[PDB]
Design a protein around this ligand. Structure first.
Ligand SMILES: CCCCCCCCCCCCCCCCCC(=O)OC[C@H](COP(=O)([O-])OCC(O)COP(=O)([O-])OC[C@@H](COC(=O)CCCCCCCCCCCCCCCCC)OC(=O)CCCCCCCCCCCCCCCCC)OC(=O)CCCCCCCCCCCCCCCCC
Ligand SMILES: CCCCCCCCCCCCCCCCCC(=O)OC[C@H](COP(=O)([O-])OCC(O)COP(=O)([O-])OC[C@@H](COC(=O)CCCCCCCCCCCCCCCCC)OC(=O)CCCCCCCCCCCCCCCCC)OC(=O)CCCCCCCCCCCCCCCCC
Ligand SMILES: CCCCCCCCCCCCCCCCCC(=O)OC[C@H](COP(=O)(O)OCCN)OC(=O)CCCCCCCCCCCCCCCCC
Ligand SMILES: CCCCCCCCCCCCCCCCCC(=O)OC[C@H](COP(=O)(O)OCCN)OC(=O)CCCCCCCCCCCCCCCCC
Ligand SMILES: CCCCCCCCCCCCCCCCCC(=O)OC[C@H](COP(=O)(O)OCCN)OC(=O)CCCCCCCCCCCCCCCCC
Ligand code: HEM
Ligand code: HEM
Ligand SMILES: [Zn+2]
Lengths: 49, 460, 386, 117, 487, 51
């Protein structure tokens, strides 16, 4: 039998499964959330200042 | 700005060309000192200017071995009038490519860009060729590079075998290796290269070839720069007499257990070169008739998968890796042979098959009329499709004006192609077979047959 | 080499900080029990700054010390904040270091190749205890005077040299102004030695890397320090700041004895003399013996055992996750150590004598037992094999 | 410059004599005092010179340093066979600096940059 | 007393060095007349004259375009089709490449051997190639053989027939060719990059497809593909060389029949199932390989997006580098100078790909496992300085380079026919060189900064690496390095 | 460094074709092919009593 680690190199499929035991993903197509990240972080930088 | 599906509003369009444009003619001009200027007009918006010299590998005394490879490598670098920085900056500023090449008989410097930069191209190329200053540290860096290159150049068996053939089969001047040797790589410096260039880059050995330039403008630009070179009688060409020999050398013994294949080749010699045009063209037609194959290629069908070699060898003995015929016409001398790759269990059979095939070609009456007609058509079609690019036409003009002194129109070559018949190829092949055998091998040498016994299988 | 510069963070000027803080490789499964070293570093820095600013308003004399402390609290802008931060940050610093020590005991961090780190840690602990005890005196209350008397006169139990060293230590015949000024100078000096020992401790750890909750080889899966453990340290620091400020602002006297607001009076004795809450285990072990020489020389086995743990050389598995019996012994030792702590603050009669004499026996049976699991379990692969 | 020239000015001549005397004492040339750690152009100029010249420079430096350690000077005869102010480094240094300037004019990046100490 | 300047082995060599350096200094004005290294913008209106492209649309929607030059001696005839591996159905994934391979055997009127011997007896040859969005079948022949070649093309496209034995033989040969391609580890890099950037979309798949799918690629599927995706409006016929437009159009109108008249264009099949860029990584660690290889990609423009010219200029101004190039360490751009001066990489090449409604933009270096940190730092630093501090000389040089490249690549009959066909499928029209120029020199520093701040600054990335990549910075390093806190 | 033994081995290679043509000083491929089991089997087979 072929190694599990080599069957994933010569088979560039595009259907990928992550580990959702901790973090869920947004459905594909949805925008990013960079602005909300800056929004959340400024509220603590104020306090530290 | 609008999307690209909608035309820009404020552009001015120069008028087009007619569907029929009468092609121009090659205008060849020689200066009093022997400098030959040639040019031709073209239709595309691009130009191509070359500079070809008669020097080469054969003009190489044993104290200056390996000089041609560096002369190729030190191509466009620090001149007497500008640095290497400025040269690279100029070339990239106008947006042009630049390249240099060296072979066993003639040097080639090329430079192409758009057609509105012709004076800059001419001036820069003439300066980079006529006034080079060889600086020791740049040459040292190039020497390190070529050391690393030659140390690892054993990944091409084809050219190594061809070099072995050309080294064993000859004895005179033409036996030198175009690729250099570690002795040369530890013997070369700036002074040697400067003296070599000073000795061999005279006036009667230089020709300018352009592809898309009016003759008068190019002449006006290149007259003040090249007319000052002194005139000097050209030294007499060296000589080499064909001498049948044999070559063997096993691969590094760390790569034998991998089942490395067996390689070898055969060869013969032609008294004529390029001055006997009919014989050379017949040899070209014969080479296209034999064809060959690679067992792995995926290119065009028209490559000759219904040629003699492919059908009558590979489809009959599948054990082969690769069969192919090759030739290398020189000035006053030619070469022909066959190179084959197969495992270490079919070797002597391969020699028998290839010698049988050569003798089958030799004997009269063995070639069908369809075969000759197909070879003729393929050869002429290949020539005409080759002549499309501007690079090819500039190189052709330069090489032809070096060899014959005048350009020979394509119609003449086509006429000479049509004159080929069965008796002519028969007689020419008879002349091929009437010469001593050259052989060489590579890979697992311990199985290749002897020279004398195989030689006896042929004629005198 | 890189014949032209790339980054400021890899230049020679910042090479040390970069290599030991930013790009240093750490295991990727470190938990929240690995933040207390940094947290203790911040506690030490807080102590140093607050002390350098208290020592601008304090006068070391027997007539003036009490009134100068009260002057600080009543007449200087924000001085009450400085005094409360100092007097409670000592307690926070001890709490954090105790948690650090018990982390080290759990996942067996003293074993090879990390015994130099353990030995330097023990030395640091001694310096900490000396500094805190010397600095509890300068306010010059009742407990300051009588605690100094008891503890520093416990050094005449030694044979012939005893009275001489006690009298040389006290600078005279009793605890008076000379002892006060002496202790003030020692208190201002020791924390810089503490800083130096901490830096040496960190270098000794960085020359082999840290352990992990598994106790296995960890050179195949590592991540850098920034930004992956910087943010975890940040979480820890903010929680610690909330806790510290709950102490400072809404209950600043719960962790002290009321008797230190009475100026020192050498004639009357308090009815119940004890030191701070973080010396009570040692104090209970010390009074557990009905003999001066034995009582004083029973502290020495404590430090000898703590300093000689690393040199047993048969145990092969580090983390207590795969060691049930040693894990149970760890929890039972923790309970017994808390019991010593509670006993150290009680009057000496029944039924506290027996309960003060047995827990020392357990506290020493811990350091006696552990090699026996080492041997009895070195031969475990041969019995349970499949 | 005019007054820097020895043959006109009359101090300048005294300055030249003093410097030549001080250099002849230890048997080294004025171009030895340059240092590859100062400029990094001296590094390149010495990286382009032939090997024999750099080797002679190293031997002269070692000789002078041994003399200075021992607190003594070369004998009078070897002080007569000396010749300071016979350069081997100035033209190459000018070439390297001129190439540096010409590269600075046309954009580009420097070929070697000093480390931040 | 001191030895004369020729009496010692080092004095002589010093004197020789000084003599050569004097030989090097004083230049000749007559060689410095026309050249100058400082770039300037030129006016090329005197040479852009070209023969006119004549486009004809038959009443079937089909398009015929030519470029008639009656002086040549050879001609190129081909068919460009608006189809590819993108428009498959997740079950027939490799069908396009399989169909391309098997198209050259059928044609029940003509068995394979007789057809191949015709074309070899004719003197010309025909090739093919497929991609995710454009398939091609074209032939090179001589002037007298154009009607014969066009007849062959029409027959092979319209009357193809498939047989089971040929299917099995093709199946095995394509398994062999799949096993052949996994050894150059660059198309592997780009297949994994295309499969990670566009996961769960059509553009994420591969042209060759699975083996577990080539197992069951039986004939009816090929017939369905032909009858479904080779429709008259979606096809283009192009020709160059010694031809005439009227002759070709009348022969085509007489010959091209029996084509399925499905009223379906590419617009509907791309309007649904769009191409969304996600942003992720794939790390393939081997460590028995001597060299590491990786690519990092932003998102790009489309064909009709008015910013593709700006992206091309940006790619030109982030040019390539290789260890055998003659440029060396004086190579115009900035990333090339860093990579070449510090010997950090083997080779690198800025790339730029366009699709309808999406694209890509990246770097793709090759290096030893010892230099990856410096390489990645230089890459990201220059990529973002693009959006911060672009200069005038760089933009002028990039514009000149792009003009020269785009014209020098159009040389010969086959490149011209390919140009006409692909520009009639992507744009719907062939843009004359004058409009290419007038659009190119209208991209100055301000537009470079604007497009860079639209595409590069603070956006997600996709990475793919292979080899000894244990020393390659993690995702967060790359992601944070796409903006600067200094400004 | 020892051309005499090199020539002797070359002579015994070229001039002979049977068993006496085998190499004595080995080559790199066999070296990459050798391990403990090969030497063990060689010794077991060829170190018999009558020899
Ligand atoms: C010029 C070059 C600047 C540079 O290199 O930036 C580096 C770096 C940012 O580099 P960057 O890559 O350019 O920024 C990327 C991120 O976006 C940068 O984002 P970030 O995540 O790195 O920033 C987070 C940071 C944001 O704040 C700042 O950095 C600016 C201020 O948050 C804090 O600094 C928290 C303040 C710490 C106070 C906690 C005190 C603990 C308890 C206090 C006592 C409790 C009693 C009551 O700056 C920092 O990370 C700040 C580190 C601060 C740690 C210092 C530790 C101080 C502890 C001493 C307190 C002891 C008590 C004294 C009494
Ligand atoms: C010592 C005092 C100096 C401290 C700063 C050193 C700066 C070194 C540096 O180059 O860093 C920049 C460095 C820039 O990286 P890069 O490789 O040069 O390239 C980044 C990009 O080019 C983009 O990055 P960049 O080059 O634009 O950022 C560098 C700098 C730009 O620097 C400049 O060139 C402009 C210089 C100032 C002119 C403007 C005024 O920009 C800033 O730093 C923004 C800060 C905002 C101003 C605040 C003042 O920042 C970082 O890489 C992140 C460092 C994060 C440091 C956090 C380390 C803390 C972790 C351990 C915590 C230990 C726990 C403590 C508890 C124990 C208690 C005792
Ligand atoms: C309160 C009064 C205290 C007075 C002192 C009391 C001391 C009691 C200590 C009892 C514990 C026993 C100590 C024995 C030390 C040496 C034992 C040992 O095993 O050393 C050997 C070992 C390497 O030898 P090895 O390779 O194993 O043998 C080869 C055989 N072929 O060596 C090693 O593995 C190297 C380990 C080095 C780490 C330990 C270094 C000493 C501890 C550092 C603390 C001192 C720092 C103080 C700083 C301030 C100084 C004032
Ligand atoms: C604990 C450190 C030892 C300090 C100590 O023992 O001091 C006692 C004594 C020095 O002071 P001392 O001699 O008692 O002065 C009284 C004069 N009648 O000790 C001495 O006389 C000499 C001390 C030398 C040993 C110091 C060890 C540290
Ligand atoms: C390593 C561990 C180091 C811990 C050091 C301190 C241990 C606890 C010290 C302590 O004093 O806690 C007991 C606390 C005091 O009770 P207190 O009322 O002050 O004494 C009687 C005077 N009227 O009384 C309390 O119950 C407060 C709770 C303190 C933590 C629990 C103590 C465990 C033992 C309690 C049950 C026995
Ligand atoms: C001022 C006092 C102390 C400071 C500043 C300090 C600081 C640190 C730091 C920063 C680390 C590494 C980071 C971490 O693992 O959390 C560490 C590790 C360690 N410390 Fe301390 N510590 C102190 C006291 C002690 C004491 C008293 C002991 C033991 C009696 C000790 C034993 C250890 C051990 C065993 C480690 C090993 C860490 C590991 O196993 O990964 N430390 N210390
Ligand atoms: C340079 C470092 C330090 C200086 C200058 C300093 C200064 C002082 C001063 C002046 C006092 C008397 C003021 C008062 O009691 O209210 C004091 C008390 C005290 N110090 Fe420090 N200190 C330093 C570090 C430390 C450290 C590191 C610790 C503990 C680890 C510590 C523990 C104490 C304690 C417990 C008190 C008792 C205060 C009370 O209970 O009321 N000090 N310090
Ligand atoms: Zn294919």
């Amino acid at each position: 039998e072929i190694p599990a680690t080599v069957a994933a190199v010569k088979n560039p499929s595009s259907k990928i499964v992550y580990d959702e035991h901790n973090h869920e993903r947004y459905p594909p197509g949805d925008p990013s959330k960079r602005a909300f990240a800056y929004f959340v972080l400024t509220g603590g930088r104020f306090v530290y200042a | 700005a609008p999307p690209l599906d909608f035309p820009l509003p404020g552009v001015t369009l120069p008028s087009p060309l007619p569907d029929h444009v009468a092609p121009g003619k090659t205008i060849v001009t020689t200066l009093p000192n022997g400098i030959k200027l040639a040019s031709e007009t073209s239709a595309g918006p691009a130009a191509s200017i070359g500079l070809y010299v008669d020097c080469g590998s054969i003009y190489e005394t044993p104290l200056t071995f390996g000089a041609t490879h560096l002369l190729e490598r030190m191509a466009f670098k620090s001149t007497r009038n500008r640095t290497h920085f400025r040269v690279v900056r100029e070339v990239e500023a106008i947006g042009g490519n630049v390249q240099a090449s060296a072979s066993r008989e003639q040097m080639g410097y090329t430079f192409d860009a758009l057609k509105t930069h012709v004076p800059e191209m001419v001036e820069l190329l003439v300066d980079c060729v006529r006034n080079p200053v060889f600086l020791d540290w740049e040459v040292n860096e190039q020497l390190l590079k070529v050391k690393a290159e030659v140390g690892e150049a054993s990944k091409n068996p084809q050219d190594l075998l061809l070099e072995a053939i050309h080294s064993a089969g000859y004895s005179g001047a033409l036996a030198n290796p175009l690729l250099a040797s570690e002795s040369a790589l530890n013997g070369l410096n700036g002074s040697i290269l400067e003296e070599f260039v000073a000795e061999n880059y005279t006036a009667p050995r230089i020709v300018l070839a352009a592809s898309g330039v009016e003759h008068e403008e190019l002449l006006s630009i290149a007259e003040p720069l090249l007319s000052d070179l002194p005139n000097v009688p050209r030294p007499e060409e060296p000589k080499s007499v064909y001498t049948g020999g044999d070559y063997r050398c096993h691969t590094e013994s760390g790569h034998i257990l991998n089942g490395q294949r067996t390689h070898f080749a055969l060869a013969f010699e032609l008294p004529g070169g390029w001055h006997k045009l009919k014989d050379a063209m017949v040899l070209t037609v014969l080479q296209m008739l034999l064809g060959g194959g690679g067992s792995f290629s995926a290119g065009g069908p028209g490559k000759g998968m219904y040629s003699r070699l492919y059908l009558r060898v590979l489809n009959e003995y599948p054990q082969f890796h690769s069969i192919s015929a090759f030739n290398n016409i020189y000035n006053n001398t030619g070469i022909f042979g066959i190179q084959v790759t197969t495992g270490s269990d079919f070797v002597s059979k391969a020699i028998d098959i290839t010698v049988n095939e050569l003798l089958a070609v030799a004997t009269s009456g063995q070639v069908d009329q369809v075969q000759l007609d197909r070879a003729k058509q393929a050869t002429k079609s290949a020539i005409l499709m080759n002549l499309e690019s501007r690079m090819v036409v500039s190189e052709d003009i330069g090489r032809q004006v070096l060899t014959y002194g005048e350009r020979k129109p394509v119609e003449d070559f086509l006429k000479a192609v049509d004159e080929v018949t069965l008796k002519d190829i028969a007689s020419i092949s008879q002349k091929l077979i009437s010469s001593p055998l050259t052989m060489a091998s590579y890979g697992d040498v311990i199985y290749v047959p002897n020279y004398e016994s195989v030689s006896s299988k042929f004629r005198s | 080499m890189r014949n032209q510069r790339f980054s400021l963070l890899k230049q020679p000027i910042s090479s040390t900080l970069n290599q030991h803080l930013i790009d240093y490789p750490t295991p990727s499964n470190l938990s929240y029990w690995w933040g207390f070293g940094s947290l203790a570093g911040i506690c030490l820095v807080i102590q140093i700054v607050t002390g350098v600013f208290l020592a601008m308003h304090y006068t070391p004399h027997v007539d003036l010390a009490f009134n100068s402390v009260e002057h600080v609290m009543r007449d200087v802008e924000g001085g009450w904040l400085l005094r409360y931060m100092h007097a409670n940050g000592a307690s926070m610093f001890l709490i954090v270091v105790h948690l650090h020590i018990f982390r080290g005991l759990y996942h067996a961090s003293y074993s090879s190749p990390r015994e130099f780190v353990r030995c330097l840690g023990v030395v640091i602990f001694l310096l900490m205890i000396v500094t805190a005890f010397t600095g509890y005196v300068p306010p010059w209350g009742q407990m300051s005077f009588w605690g100094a008397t008891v503890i520093t006169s416990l050094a005449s139990a030694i044979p012939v040299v005893g009275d001489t060293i006690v009298t040389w230590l006290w600078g005279g015949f009793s605890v008076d102004n000379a002892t006060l000024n002496r202790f003030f100078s020692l208190h201002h000096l020791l924390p810089f030695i503490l800083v130096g020992a901490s830096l040496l401790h960190l270098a000794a750890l960085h020359q082999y890397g840290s352990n992990n909750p598994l106790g296995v080889h960890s050179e195949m899966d590592q991540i850098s320090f920034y930004p992956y453990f910087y943010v975890k340290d940040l979480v820890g620091w903010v929680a610690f700041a909330i806790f510290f400020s709950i102490w400072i602002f809404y209950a600043p006297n719960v962790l002290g004895h009321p008797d230190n607001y009475i100026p020192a009076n050498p004639m009357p004795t308090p009815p119940h003399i004890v030191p701070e809450w973080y010396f009570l285990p040692i104090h209970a072990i010390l009074r557990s013996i009905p003999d001066k020489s034995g009582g004083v020389a029973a502290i020495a086995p404590v430090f000898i055992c703590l300093l000689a743990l690393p040199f047993f050389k048969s145990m092969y598995v580090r983390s207590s996750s795969f060691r049930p019996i040693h894990q149970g012994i760890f929890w039972l030792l923790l309970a017994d150590r808390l019991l010593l702590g509670w006993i150290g603050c009680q009057p000496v009669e029944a039924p506290f004598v027996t309960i003060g004499q047995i827990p020392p026996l357990v506290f020493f049976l811990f350091f006696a037992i552990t090699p026996i699991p080492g041997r009895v379990g070195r031969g475990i692969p041969n019995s349970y094999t499949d | 410059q005019s007054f820097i020239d020895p043959k006109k000015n009359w101090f300048a001549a005294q300055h030249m004599k003093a410097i030549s005397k001080r250099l002849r004492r230890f048997g080294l040339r004025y171009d030895d005092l340059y240092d590859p750690y100062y400029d990094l152009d001296v590094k390149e100029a010495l990286n382009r010179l032939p090997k024999e010249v750099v080797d002679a420079r190293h031997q002269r430096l070692k000789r002078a340093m041994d003399l200075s350690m021992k607190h003594e000077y070369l004998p009078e005869d070897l002080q007569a066979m000396q010749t300071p102010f016979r350069g081997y480094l100035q033209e190459m240094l000018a070439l390297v600096k001129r190439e540096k300037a010409e590269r600075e004019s046309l954009g580009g990046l420097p070929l070697y940059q000093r480390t931040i100490p | 007393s001191p030895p004369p300047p020729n009496a010692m082995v080092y004095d002589r060599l010093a004197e020789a060095v000084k003599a050569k350096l004097r030989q090097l200094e004083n230049p000749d004005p007559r060689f410095l007349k026309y050249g100058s290294p400082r770039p300037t913008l030129t006016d090329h209106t005197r040479i852009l004259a070209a023969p006119e492209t004549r486009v004809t649309t038959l009443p079937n929607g089909l398009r015929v375009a030519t470029e008639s030059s009656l002086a040549a001696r050879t001609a190129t005839v081909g068919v460009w089709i608006d189809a590819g591996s993108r428009f498959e159905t997740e079950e027939s994934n490799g069908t396009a490449h399989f169909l391309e391979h098997m198209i050259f055997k059928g044609t029940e009127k003509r068995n394979a051997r007789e057809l191949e011997e015709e074309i070899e007896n004719m003197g010309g040859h025909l090739n093919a190639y497929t991609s995710r969005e454009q398939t091609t079948y074209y032939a090179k022949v001589a002037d007298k053989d154009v009607p014969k070649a066009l007849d062959i093309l029409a027959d092979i496209l319209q009357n193809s027939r498939f047989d089971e034995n040929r299917i099995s033989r093709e199946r095995d040969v394509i398994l062999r060719e799949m096993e052949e391609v996994e050894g150059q580890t660059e198309e592997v890099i780009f297949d994994h990059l295309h499969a990670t950037a566009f996961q769960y979309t059509p553009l994420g798949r591969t042209i060759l497809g699975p083996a577990q799918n080539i197992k069951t690629i039986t004939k009816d599927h090929l017939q369905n593909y032909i009858q479904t995706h080779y429709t008259a409006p979606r096809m283009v016929i192009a020709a160059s060389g010694a031809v005439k437009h009227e002759d070709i159009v009348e022969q085509v109108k007489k010959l091209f029949t029996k084509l399925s008249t499905d009223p379906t264009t590419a617009s509907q099949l791309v309007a649904k199932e769009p191409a969304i860029f996600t942003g992720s990584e794939v790390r393939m660690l081997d460590d028995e390989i001597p060299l590491a290889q990786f690519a990092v990609a932003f998102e790009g423009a489309s064909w009709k997006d008015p910013d593709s010219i700006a992206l091309m200029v940006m790619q030109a101004m982030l040019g390539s580098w290789n260890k055998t190039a003659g440029g060396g360490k004086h190579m115009g751009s900035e990333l090339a100078q860093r990579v070449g001066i510090n010997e950090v990489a083997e080779s690198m090449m800025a790339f730029n790909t366009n699709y309808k409604d999406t694209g890509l933009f990246g770097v793709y270096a090759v290096a030893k496992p010892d230099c990856l940190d410096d390489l990645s730092y230089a890459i990201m630093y220059e990529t973002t300085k693009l959006a911060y501090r672009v200069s005038d000389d760089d933009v002028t040089r990039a514009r000149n380079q792009l003009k020269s490249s785009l014209l020098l690549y159009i040389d010969g009959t086959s490149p011209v026919a390919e140009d006409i066909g692909r520009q009639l499928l992507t744009y719907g029209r062939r843009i004359p060189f004058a409009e290419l120029f007038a659009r190119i020199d209208a991209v100055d520093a301000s537009t470079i900064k604007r497009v860079a701040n639209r595409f590069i600054y603070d956006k997600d990335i996709a990475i793919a690496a292979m080899g000894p990549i244990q020393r390659l910075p993690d995702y967060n390093w790359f992601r944070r390095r796409t903006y600067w806190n200094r400004y």
